[PDB]
Nucleic acid binder design. Sequence first.
RNA 1: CAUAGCCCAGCUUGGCGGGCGAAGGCCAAGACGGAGAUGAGGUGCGC
Lengths: 567, 152
Amino acid sequence: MTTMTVHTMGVHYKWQIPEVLRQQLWLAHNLREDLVSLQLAYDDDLKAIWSSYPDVAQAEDTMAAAEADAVALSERVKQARIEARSTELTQQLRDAKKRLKDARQARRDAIAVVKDDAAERRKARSDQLAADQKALYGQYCRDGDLYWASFNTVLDHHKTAVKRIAAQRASGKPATLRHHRFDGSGTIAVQLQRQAGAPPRTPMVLADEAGKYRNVLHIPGWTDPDVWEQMTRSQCRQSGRVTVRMRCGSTDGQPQWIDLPVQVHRWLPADADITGAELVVTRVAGIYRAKLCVTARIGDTEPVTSGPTVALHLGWRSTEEGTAVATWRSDAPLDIPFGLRTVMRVDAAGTSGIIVVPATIERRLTRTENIASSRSLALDALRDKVVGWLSDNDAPTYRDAPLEAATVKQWKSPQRFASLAHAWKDNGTEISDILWAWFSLDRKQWAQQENGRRKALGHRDDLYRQIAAVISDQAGHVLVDDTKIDRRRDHAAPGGLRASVVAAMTRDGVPVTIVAAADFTRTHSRCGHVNPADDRYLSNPVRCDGCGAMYDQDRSFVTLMLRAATA
Amino acid sequence: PEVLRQQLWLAHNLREDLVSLQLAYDDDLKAIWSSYPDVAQAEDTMAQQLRDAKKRLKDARQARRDAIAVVKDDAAERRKARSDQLAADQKALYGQYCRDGDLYWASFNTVLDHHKTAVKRIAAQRASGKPATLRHHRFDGRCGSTDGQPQW
RNA sequence: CAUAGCCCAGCUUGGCGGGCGAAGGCCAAGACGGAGAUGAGGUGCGC
Ligand SMILES: [Mg+2]
Ligand SMILES: [Zn+2]
């Protein structure tokens, strides 16, 4: 009964956005941005406190000197490359990089040794941070128009993000939070309060028009899924067009609701316990798509006992019909649906196979990239033409302010051009036609340049998700490794396959085992010999040192995974 | 006010009439062009394997435009006469909408400019090979006159 | 405005019919825990 589930419901595209919902997203944006600013302030205070220690000061000075030397040697290497227009200097740069890394390690050690001394300072700063957040809540809710559920959702997103960033900094990339501009896309939420000794907030309670949550969330017309699976797709998709009443927010101290047209495709089991509902507004190519997500609690499933062990392995080796994204082996023969037989290949015995992604995904993403490049060139052409016209003519006022060729010359994003164009719809100036002729065209392309991508990516996700299902249909146990060239890997992205497989195995209760993939690729299954060279594997197949015969590295990988599992 | 609603309804009505008149005027020009036997033959002709058809289609499209240019001078009077016909009909709508209607004359003048502005953009747009056109927009919802009584 | 893509009751795939910033949807197979485009830092809105 611990498991949580989330069901998605789409909103009608011929639905506008009320003024109250815009006000809520605006406030949510402002809250998130102030929170990011406070996060950076807190981080700066922490860095300053760390720096306060004289040993840390010395380490930081050494680090700064090493960084300056490294950047100077990088400049020298760049100058040598320019003069050559394309080894000892690189070695000096490598030495500088080593010195910088050593200084960084020394600084980390200096922080570590003195860490127990500034704990009180760090706790005091963190407490001040918490107090500032509480003041933010008092402003936004007790004195503001934000609904307290949305504030909680934004805070939870923010604290998830900060942990993500801290993990990334610990794990490499010195990334950080970046402010964002209010495009009009946001998140709102509503919580379901269930005090102690209260009846479950059953989905049937929600469909009541006089229920305990008629003022908070109401999705009329629920059906038992047992009946639902028998209704034809016609009455199914016709029945799901229902009108959700949702508490949205307050304006001048008055609650405001919205009435979303949603098309529900799956209902929740009668024993469920809803937790909350969050409405997500996304902008893609200037179209406001919305989506309502409902989260609840559901009883767990009994873990399986019978079912062959299935082992999976990942790569990104190429194949003439698409990227070969995985190789799977099974303890016993498996059954694969007929609609997927051209994506999840199978062998004669039915116990081995290759997962490939059809190349059409690659072709579509390449089309998107080429449309991106062409849009960039046409963007530059319009920039030049508008600059020329502005130089040779008068400047009608934009935002009640004269337009200067320098400012127009510095534009890089389409946004400024778009706003200017919508401003000069009917000025009668020729540039306006020149400023509209581009605009419309690009929004046809912009749609494609985004939508196709998402659509194409969606397709790939579908395949992976479908694959997950089939394995959980038969597998009593599933094993996974703990593991142009990068672009192809960014298109196929086996990481998605791993995530979907693990998620499906968790939902269905199948045991998941992470195999230690250490010393496997260099290891041949048949001859049992490791191979020290780390460059022979770039091609397939690879000759074996212990046997002198070429073998499939992936097949040996899955064979070894099964053998280690079968111990 | 209902006066505001009716004026917009008249405003929506006027644009449809102007759009209706334009296409007939647009069709009349097409009929004027189709009169020449060379134009009609090209239209019938207009009416890796992908590229061959596309090339021939545009060549047929270009030839129809080519036939238009050569006999442009010989049809100038006929095109003007229908052009004068369109203006007179457009003038007639002023009497029905403004002289004999409650629609404010400023509203008519504004929309007339917008349509005339629209056709200028459209006419050149179709010229190079980039087609688009006016279509009927469905009604969605001083303040002129009311049975000859001005209202504010 | 490029010459096939995008869109038209969640999503992806097929098929029927439509729209090119607007319209118009219908049918079928399957699957589904929401929470990741560095482009911005606007202090309300690529209409
Ligand atoms: Mg859909
Ligand atoms: Zn061997």
